[PDB]
Amino acid sequence: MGRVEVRVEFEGDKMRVRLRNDSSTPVEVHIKVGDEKRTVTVNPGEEVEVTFSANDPHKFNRPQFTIEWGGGGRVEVRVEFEGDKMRVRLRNDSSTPVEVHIKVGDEKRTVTVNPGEEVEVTFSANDPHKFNRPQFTIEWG
């Protein structure tokens, strides 16, 4: 087994990314929020928070993170907040299939991404403020 949690939090001109590693191995999470690109190592049991800042809160409309882990594994998560919906693309560039759980207020979506596969997850909302604190869990077999 093994779980990796990502929570994105929008608070005005700030965007916090909290990462938990609930797995047996250390992960390296590559974040790219607009022009800014940060990389962090999250060790098992560790919780890491990286805060991003912006002039325009539309720099935050396409956050992207790659949970990479020792032994070439990559899980790519690209978020896209366009209009009334939040679009998420998940790509499993690992040999194990991963299960991805995304929560956004009242709605929670779960998909399986098989190795080499790339799946889309779109949420709709009336108030785009429903996407202010989205969560992502990646559990491997």
Residue numbers in the entry: 0 to 140
Describing publication, verbatim:
Here, we devise geometrical principles for de novo designing single-chain immunoglobulin dimers, as a tunable two-domain architecture that optimizes biophysical properties through more favorable dimer interfaces. Here, we devise principles for de novo designing single-chain Ig dimers with interfaces diverging from Fvs, as a two-domain Ig architecture that is hard to find in nature and optimizes folding stability. We envisioned that de novo single-chain Ig dimers could be designed through two-layer edge-to-edge dimeric interfaces, resulting in extended Ig β-sandwiches. Key to such robustness is the two-layer edge-to-edge strand pairing at the interface between Ig domains, which involves a high number of backbone-backbone hydrogen bonds and protects oligomerization-prone β-sheet edges from solvent; overall favoring monomeric stability and solubility.
